[PDB]
From a paper:
The mature HIV-1 capsid is composed of the capsid (CA) protein arranged in a conical lattice of hexamers and pentamers. CA assembles into a conical lattice formed by roughly 200 CA hexamers and exactly twelve CA pentamers, the latter of which facilitate lattice curvature and closure around the viral genome. Monomeric CA consists of two folded domains connected by a flexible linker: The N-terminal domain (NTD) faces the outer surface of the capsid, where it stabilizes the hexamer, while the C-terminal domain (CTD) forms dimeric interactions that link hexamers together. Here, we present cryoelectron microscopy structures of continuous regions of the capsid lattice containing both hexamers and pentamers.
These CLPs have a predominantly conical morphology resembling that of authentic HIV-1 capsids. We next sought to generate higher-resolution structures of the CLP pentamer using SPA cryo-EM. We focused our analysis on regions of the lattice containing pentamers and determined the structure of the pentamer surrounded by five hexamers (the “global” pentamer structure) to an estimated resolution of 3.6 Å. As in isolated authentic capsids, pentamers in our CLPs were quite scarce, present at a pentamer to hexamer ratio of ~1:20. The structure of the pentamer within the capsid/CLP lattice differs significantly from published crystal structures of cross-linked pentamers and instead matches the structure of the pentamer within the virion. This indicates that a combination of capsid protein (CA) and IP6 is sufficient to reconstitute the viral pentamer structure—no other virus-specific factor is required.
Residue numbers in the entry:
A (entry chain C), B (entry chain C), C (entry chain C): 1 to 85, 96 to 222
D (entry chain D), E (entry chain A): 12 to 85, 96 to 220
């Protein structure tokens, strides 16, 4: 990150070792669940591109994931260079491989600031979303409430898979409205259909509390 | 949060990356148990509205929960604007979407301080209470001691569900006084009725120690 | 690590007690999984050779692991002294046993910096790679998808073992391309062969989602 | 104004009775009712003999749409009941379509009827698209035909329909066909899908 | 603008229903849709009940042809979707037809539909031409009629079609007709083959 000096100069504060260790734990233990994206967003708050590259050096242990992460970063950099044909930050400068750290500080501290950090964070989040989409164990259509599974657990699994699949907004709305009811077990599906169309998730959860 | 400079000026200290990661872990892993409210209160100590919005960007992954969190925030903001018809902080300013950070510092550092942070924290806690009330797996009437469940575990589950359901104070007192005894298994229910009315929880727990 | 003083002098900041405790937890609890190398890389960011020796004092509890870690460090130091026949840092100085801390600061703060810390980190990572290669439970050829194991879990186990075995790059590419398909169960192996040669891991994972 | 042809009326009644309510009824109605006035539309609806429950639902939906029109809009301007043709006369209905700028009362009523018929078709479909699934020995061509008929009777949005087309067709097939479809993999076209799945 | 006749619409639906997708449906469509606009062609396709697999394939081929037209050609000009009528409107279609020189969106869409229907017929050929074998007692008349119906359905290239007519016709005949055809020899026209093979 970037922190004011005692005299006010913005000097780069290196990302702490335990923050990197936490990111490593998320990458290794979590097996690219849908929750690695909120955790990445939390850990990389205010991180510069050099810090983001330091973090991706930990996910570099995985071959395919790092490969398509860098390919998505390259695609986004090409898009930026198309939109954007000290020096102005180029697409490769945002990646923190051709630019130097002092240039990163100058870009992040400008008036208004040049959000190179947030741009690179968004690109990396797109790559992580693709990786998460690969690693999901089951598609949304596979999820179905068990004979005795409570509706809370089934809804949690359904929304986890929905976050994993990353469908469009309208498709997601239709899925949450209809496919959730369709996949529910018959005992709860009866109450879900009794509630009728337009049933908010609050009503669906309260009505099915303890049915299983 | 807000921290004094070396020269004494109150400069905003950004919420640490690991604090945000801890909040993300609470949101994702805990599945909105009743304990996410104490954990939110601990993590957001002294947080400004911008920090609270940064934290809610992590719970934004959930659709319905974030939706009714923002709707409860809007209701509370409307209530504030009804009560309240640099500039005085408006309801939307408390939400940290129309106000700027420097205005937040000015409001929090006033003499006496304008507790915008605590007000927004209370609103967010109301929203989280509603979300927790949805996600409870069973109602209070469902809880019942098992054939061999120790009374300590049964009381812990009962009080967890009681925190989840968030009934009124008088209703909560009646429930803890009577419904706890009623739902207990017969072997412990005999001792509970033998103790008679007005039995404090200490006496009930000590009398039933090791009965199961 | 090394941190600027209030007056700008680079004074050594001792590695925090909790960072050492985290490294101890990684060494003891993880049983030298393949993930101890990313975790070591994260924890030892910017660490000087004295800090690295302090960290290896924790892995010194294990006899054989510490023995071959120090033997690999000695081999790399001999290689450095062959390449390299205040004073210039010698191979033993990089190990942080003959050099003093102030010399380490002088070497790390030079223009351009003398990356003694990163060199020693690379040597220690080579030693840890050897130790991990010993402690792997099964060879790559042993891994095989179960009758009902999802392809995601099987791929995760396969890539964990691949990281453990540390084969050459071409051998690793051939293994991931062919041995992964060969070891898969017949139901998924049919789809893997149907995809044909040159199937990227993304296509293989998406095609086999939910087959088990 | 020209009266609706008796041949056209007989064709409309015949297709309604024969098809009961299949998804083709909506384009058939749109084709037959080209430029028709509300009087002619009411004639076409009233002339239907059977399926009087469905005709009652169509009347109810027309009433709801008329109420919504009256809510939004509280010769003379036409109200909802005027658009429905219950109150408007034939001369009045010739009016409102020649003012230029007009208010196409006939097309506005046709829209309400089309919405009602979409509801009727969606209910009359035998099963939902998610419930549609290939049999153990069903031919894949027949299963595709049933699936796309149900999808036509679905009433979902266009993006949702595209997602259904891409995913559910592969997902719902029996394992013998599903293995072949998975081997073909994503991005394949329906022609390749059945030519591979011909067996 | 002239709306399409209910008689013509019902004739198209009836011929599709009764002939399934025999090769004559392509010329029947070309005849009935003469001068039709994109809206009229969309009605013509949508009104077809059953064979929704084939209608889906026609829609997919329409989308592919629209995409190719868009790459070839990247009031507003017509896109492929506009030509297909999904995005454009009847007023814009009439304007494109009326422009000097005109942009024949109707003929382009008809060509796309004809390509789709050709693919449909090629698939819906019930049996491959290699399996058309004369029975022990079947007339050569019925045998060659079946053979040429299948050959029209297959829609193979000219050279392979000529080879088929030269070789498979005599190869697949029953022994009684096979001997006569072999004695007659190669380099023969169909009228010669049939008039020699009578009885």
């Amino acid at each position: 990150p970037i922190v004011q000096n005692l005299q006010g100069q913005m000097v780069h504060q290196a990302i702490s070792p335990r923050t990197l260790n936490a990111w490593v734990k998320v990458v290794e233990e979590k097996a690219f669940s849908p929750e690695v994206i909120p955790m990445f967003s939390a850990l990389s708050e205010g991180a510069t591109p050099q810090d983001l590259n330091t973090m991706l050096n930990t996910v570099g242990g995985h071959q395919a994931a790092m490969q398509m992460l860098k390919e998505t970063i390259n695609e986004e950099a090409a898009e930026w260079d198309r939109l954007h044909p000290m020096r102005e930050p180029r697409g490769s400068d945002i990646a923190g491989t051709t630019s130097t750290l002092q240039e990163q500080i100058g870009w992040m501290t400008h008036n208004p600031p040049i959000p190179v950090g947030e741009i690179y964070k968004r690109w990396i989040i797109l790559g992580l979303n693709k990786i998460v989409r690969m690693y999901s164990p089951t598609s949304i259509l596979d999820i179905r409430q068990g004979p005795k599974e409570p509706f809370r657990d089934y809804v949690d699994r359904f929304y986890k898979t929905l976050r994993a699949e990353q469908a469009s907004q309208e498709v997601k709305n239709w899925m949450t409205e209809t496919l959730l009811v369709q996949n529910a077990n018959p005992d709860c599906k009866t109450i879900l259909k009794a509630l009728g169309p337009g049933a908010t998730l609050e009503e669906m959860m309260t009505a099915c509390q303890g049915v299983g």
